[PDB]
Write a protein that binds this ligand. Sequence first.
Ligand SMILES: Nc1ncnc2c1ncn2[C@H]1C[C@H](O)[C@@H](COP(=O)(O)OP(=O)(O)OP(=O)(O)O)O1
Ligand SMILES: Nc1ncnc2c1ncn2[C@H]1C[C@H](O)[C@@H](COP(=O)(O)OP(=O)(O)OP(=O)(O)O)O1
Ligand SMILES: [Mg+2]
Ligand SMILES: [Mg+2]
Lengths: 193, 194
Amino acid sequence: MKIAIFGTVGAGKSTISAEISKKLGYEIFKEPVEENPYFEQYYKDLKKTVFKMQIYMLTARSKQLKQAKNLENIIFDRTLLEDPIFMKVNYDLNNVDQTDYNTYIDFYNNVVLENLSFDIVIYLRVSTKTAISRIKKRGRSEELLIGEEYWETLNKNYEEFYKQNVYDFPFFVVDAELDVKTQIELIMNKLNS
Amino acid sequence: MKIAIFGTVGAGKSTISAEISKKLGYEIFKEPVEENPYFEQYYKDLKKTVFKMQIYMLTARSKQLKQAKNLENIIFDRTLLEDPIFMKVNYDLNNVDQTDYNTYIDFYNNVVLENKLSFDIVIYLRVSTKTAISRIKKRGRSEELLIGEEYWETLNKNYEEFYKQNVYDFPFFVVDAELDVKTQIELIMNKLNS
Ligand SMILES: Nc1ncnc2c1ncn2[C@H]1C[C@H](O)[C@@H](COP(=O)(O)OP(=O)(O)OP(=O)(O)O)O1
Ligand SMILES: Nc1ncnc2c1ncn2[C@H]1C[C@H](O)[C@@H](COP(=O)(O)OP(=O)(O)OP(=O)(O)O)O1
Ligand SMILES: [Mg+2]
Ligand SMILES: [Mg+2]
């Protein structure tokens, strides 16, 4: 049983994974957030940090894969293949031009994807406004520094990623507008088969 | 016979590779310099472009690998493992701070170094900084004139350091690149015939 929890910032991926990790007793794998040296920088000045951030995060994914692909029972807060979503966002908001985005996608497919799977990818589908409010009460204060446009563009691209599903994830969709209690009940049900 | 030609900017790698090819028939694999959209930008403003530049370059290297893999005879103008030299330079010259440097190499080790070409000979064209700067002026690229001498000094230092440390254990063959071209080709052909 290899589980992943998928969705934008403030979707409640951490709250959901923790509860699951309590109920089934598996280990949660979490990307560096407190340890990321570019975190505050990233939200003050996207244009200047996007590349630094991206290279750091891609290194971290590469490490997680090393340990994960020899374990039967795992829970993943985010998957390894979701970094281009944040790039695509900066591209849409004109922090990254065509050339950069072409270099990155050329980079991603020809350098990164040379590393080359879950049982279920839970998608916490949520509106922008709700995620924004969960950043206010559950997320990192740095995340409070950029405008709404960023979060809108992120949510948009997350759904886009889910609809195109280019890696063929065994997706399962949960309406995250519901309170956590219900979300857990629907997740535990689906997992029981 | 897989040949790689190794040295700092203006060592005369292109001249030497062209001569060898002329005698032997082997294909030369240049790096993208002309089709590189960051080239002028990079020399105009290092700080803002080093990461963009680096990402492009490793991407290019990986393509060259994935087209020269199966070829019996190759001549490489530079190997795929020399990009960290350029990053180290910018680190000494305070274009990149300690973290960015660590991020770059942490990525290089975990992603790039995990993977393959085996050169029979890596020909180090060893030059003084002064000879290099003049060759940049003679037959180099016009954009390479845009930064101060101190860049080329550090780059030559790091190139010498790379050879002395020989981390990847290349089969190095040193050539005195101060010598005229004709003589360099004599030394190289003689070695190649073994
Ligand atoms: N590739 C990337 N580029 C830029 N920022 C990133 C990237 N990956 C992650 N981040 C940032 C955005 C968020 O602030 C944080 C990622 O974690 P996030 O999506 O918030 O999950 P989370 O574990 O906090 O659960 P949730 O927020 O769903 O409760 O780090
Ligand atoms: N990783 C990199 N980072 C920054 N600049 C780079 C990188 N790789 C290549 N370059 C730049 C520096 C130089 O301007 C040019 C490299 O070509 P160069 O060293 O001049 O070889 P060359 O084929 O012209 O032979 P030579 O100059 O020795 O005759 O591209
Ligand atoms: Mg969060
Ligand atoms: Mg040159």
